[model samples]
Target: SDLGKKLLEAARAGQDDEVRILLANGADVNTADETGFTPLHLAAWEGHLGIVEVLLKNGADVNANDERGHTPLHLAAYTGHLEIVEVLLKNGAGVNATDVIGTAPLHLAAMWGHLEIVEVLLKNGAAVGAQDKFGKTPKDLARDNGNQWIYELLEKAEKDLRRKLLEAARAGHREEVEKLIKLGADVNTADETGFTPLHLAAWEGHLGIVEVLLKNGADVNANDERGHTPLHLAAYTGHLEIVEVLLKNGAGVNATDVIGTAPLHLAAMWGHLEIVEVLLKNGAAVGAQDKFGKTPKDLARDNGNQWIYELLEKAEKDLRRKLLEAARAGHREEVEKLIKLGADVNTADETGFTPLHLAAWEGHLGIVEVLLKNGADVNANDERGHTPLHLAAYTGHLEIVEVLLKNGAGVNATDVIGTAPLHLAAMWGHLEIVEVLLKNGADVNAQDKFGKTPFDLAIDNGNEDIAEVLQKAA
Candidate 1:
């Protein structure tokens, strides 16, 4: 440890000979002082290029950080040590390394009005857009320090870097992508093809590049010439990691292309089962159809993807069940939300009970009203051939009965037993409902499978009030 401290002090003092001697004598080149400042960091900060070179040649970490995440390159750039900065960068120091305050080497150089140092760092791929603890960029720091020349230099470099960035991203050049991004290239810059960096990165399955682009504010939903988002291409290429990254960045899972093909559809058609599962888990629309009237399940089946087909089938079923439960519980807001999220109002359960049927059966008047407004069939029949009107009449929901009738419900609609709404109303002693149905043109003489008329049902149930009213109509 004492020898390590001696090596650090010698390197800091620009004693190249002593640094070499210490390194040869088995003293660690990477040894740091109490402040986490390695010998290379101290030497670079002191403008000791010779000692810095000696430490680097002896296996010192070129990009080693101190307690504040400042690498030797960072300290060199901040101190405006031109030759030392060059040596550190040539030794593979991270040009974009930031401190604990998010201050990249560029910020420190710009803040101190180091015009030449700013140019050097920028030429070495330092990000002008990198913000510090106060959310100020290097350019802002330069301006604040009254270094108008350096500020203008950064402004021009930013414009030029962005143009080159678009080309580099399209070519899938990772090094260029890294350099352009750190130089404050526009991450969201779209090409003439409308393809942003994210689109190209995702399409090429460049996971690391995608991460950089996203962190720099690339739009995950940006569409290209084909209206294809990053998620669409990720799924199409079957790049599971890229797709995951896009999804985590808030990429629209159900976003549709120009042809109405969603990410799920692309994943399914390409037999990307893992991507399909991810999309489903992220609440993708399982039953969304494309321009060809084909759902993801249809695409899966057409592509001979039985696994995806079954997975989509189960998801659709589960979604429908949740919608039904929400509707049955009279959760009107929840039902509306589900419908907007792509739930089918017409989807029926095994018992042929749609949301409308359940809403009517449970006397959920508000839910029934919402379902009808959203295009629920007024005359849809359940497994028992009971329409909403019949259930409303039997449940003694007078207002719901009126609502169903007003919405073009068949007054004489018959059930499986040939029992009409009027018959059910009569059987249940709903005299007022009988009057409403009759007023709506219910056949007073309608017959059931047993050949019993509404009047006969009223009499069979021993309802004298209904029998008296029905007798006059008959």
Candidate 2:
């Protein structure tokens, strides 16, 4: 034992000849001192490359732990000995070998700003994010030491390691995934195809892997190779439990894929009626469309699933009615939300009363503004050939009339009865509407089916003010 201690002491003191002689005299090169410092650890700590070579040549355990569980590589890194670190690594040292406090050799090398040693350790597969007892990683140590180079090095290594973890998750190697995560792997790392662990798991129907990924903070709404989210894959695969898990984790039920196909559309197209119901109950839009101008209901109808088609039909009708009602009620926020859900801005009711027509007729200037801004036809005609302008003028909505005129509404737009906005305003006896219409170039001589001009209507209605204004123009 004294010979072993002498060997360790000789290695620590850089006594290359004594280390060689001791190791040659049947002395165990793997032996440690009372403090558990083996000859290899001593040689590495002292930067004694020659003694380290002798010990390693004599079968020294490169991975032998000291009393504090620090391997020779840890000491080599702590001493900033680039050559000793390389030798230990080449001798099969554990680059990620942890000490008593869970501090890896990478952390020690980085904490001391040993740039070359850190590089060698990382190149040898060190876990850059391995945390110590204090929960600090090598990057944290580098930051605390003011070593920007080491910090940047560890940051880059962690990013690559996260990619490896994602690959493991994609392969459904749950144990490796958990191990990588325990070593500080990033859970949300996406591969080159934009496919995350959750996407792969859901696509493959690995429900257990899905749970593991979600538990590790995988994004539920993350899209993959074809802009398909986990929800899209789940719906396409008709995995009821996966769909429920994704939805519960805040997955977007209405998330569209590359072709603008929402999860609901996939469910409908594939005849997954139960998923459709779940999506609907979770507020999925029944009217959501894909790039092909097809709604989920359209997909259902095409797929020939009678029950799904009927269910979506009802939902679509309800949504259309809701949109119209919101517009009529001047619920601007609701109208915007409905529009976002793919409600046609110009969608008309049974009487061809579009949301815009209803809003204008109801005197909701704000709702009318919202609809017009979102591509509502300023001159959209109803079944009776009454444009929004016609209704606003007939209802004596002076402001609504002005808004329409400003947005390029036909000043002389006539309805099916050949009644112009000017005729409606003058017949209603709205002196302000008459004046505003005339100011916006409403044709005063315009006649209706009865062959009566706006002036004649004003006179017949006994609106002296309107008649006077129209007569002066005539």
Candidate 3:
């Protein structure tokens, strides 16, 4: 008994070596005086952090409450021993333990303006709303001590509810998500994975969950571990309408992941064609290159996603149609612009009329020349088996006929009914084209299906000048 008394005295006095010696000599660390003040209470109360740790290692009652309902933590809290408070909390010192007077470690710590102790208490799950005998919270006690700093700290620290909000939002609990918002929850904090509630909701394709966040102003561009924002996830996962929802509210059309992989890149890699379509049109640059220098357009080809790649191909078709109309209307500037925009040069129309056929028929010499140079199919045929060369002959564009003759424009390839370009030129009475064909070695005996020769068709048309021109040429 005297030895235990000596042990308590050594611990209370902060005698490190003596306390260890007492414990080694069978001094019960849990042995207490009649008032229930164990060596731990005295050590923590006296700010002997070394002794408190020693007693704990020797199996001291961490919750040693005396007759006054004050545990070692309660004593340490009010006494302003910040170091012992932390040590005790780390070793399972009950933070919110109510003493006889309706006070937590928070309550007594607040009254004394032990700012460090109160901070430590709250971080370790201090019950901020716990009330004392006077219907006053620890916040009220901070106010009672006239310390606005501590009071304000308690006031705002109570709003550390983003974790709860994220979980509720992530779980898609509509009522709870909105209800928690109504009661003041932090909707902005990210999870351990750096996913905010908005990221989780959008990545999960939960529209209502996402709307709850967007309506409340969450960071739509907040990136996760890979710097993948909410839009990035929605695009990658092919959330059919969430990106529409995300984009309308102003998200990151330009947001990218760590590899500089944009949402468009992710959409293309995942074969999310419609997602790519909307993103690219809505200011997501298809030309935004990733770390590998591959843009979304390039990524689609690399990943072999026809679903995405063909959408780009389909766009070429659209531009090709426009190129056809522009060439037909002889808009030389528009033709150049469409070609620069990657329009298909060999684009064939409804009647299998290529740009060359349209340009030649319209007598747009510059357009025809440009089409032929830009790899438009020179001998591409129409539905009637007539090539641009045939149109060049029948339409009597002597300039077009002149150019077509040199560039694989088969003069002898017969159209339907066995009509050749030379015969068509003769039948249509383009006397200059006939002589031009004859000069280019047109078969002077070129015949139609009925064996009607080009020279005969010239005479049959009854233009004496054309008949006289053909007679000498023949």
* lDDT by residue for model 3 (196-275), tens: 88888887778998888788877777877778888988987889689998899888787878898888888888898788
Error of 2 at 194 (Å): 3.3
The C-alpha TM-scores of every prediction are: 0.65, 0.67, 0.41
User: What's the CA error at residue 113 for candidate 1, in Å?
Assistant: 15
Where does candidate 2 stray beyond 4 Å?
1-106, 109-127, 130-176, 286-293, 449-451
Comparing 1 and 3 on lDDT, the stronger one: 1
Say which prediction, candidate 1 or candidate 2, comes out ahead on TM-score.
Answer: 2
User: How high is the lDDT of residue 104 in model 3?
Assistant: 83
Note the Cα lDDT for every prediction shown: 0.86, 0.84, 0.82
Using TM-score, give the best candidate's number.
2
TM-score of 3: 0.41
Question: What is the TM-score of candidate 2?
Answer: 0.67
> Given candidate 1, what's the lDDT at residue 430?
95
Residue lDDT tens for model 2, 297-406 = 88878879889999987876777788999998889899988887667788899999999999988999999898898899998998899999999988989899899899
Off by over 4 Å in 1: 1-156, 167-179, 320-326, 329-344, 347-351, 449-456, 459-474
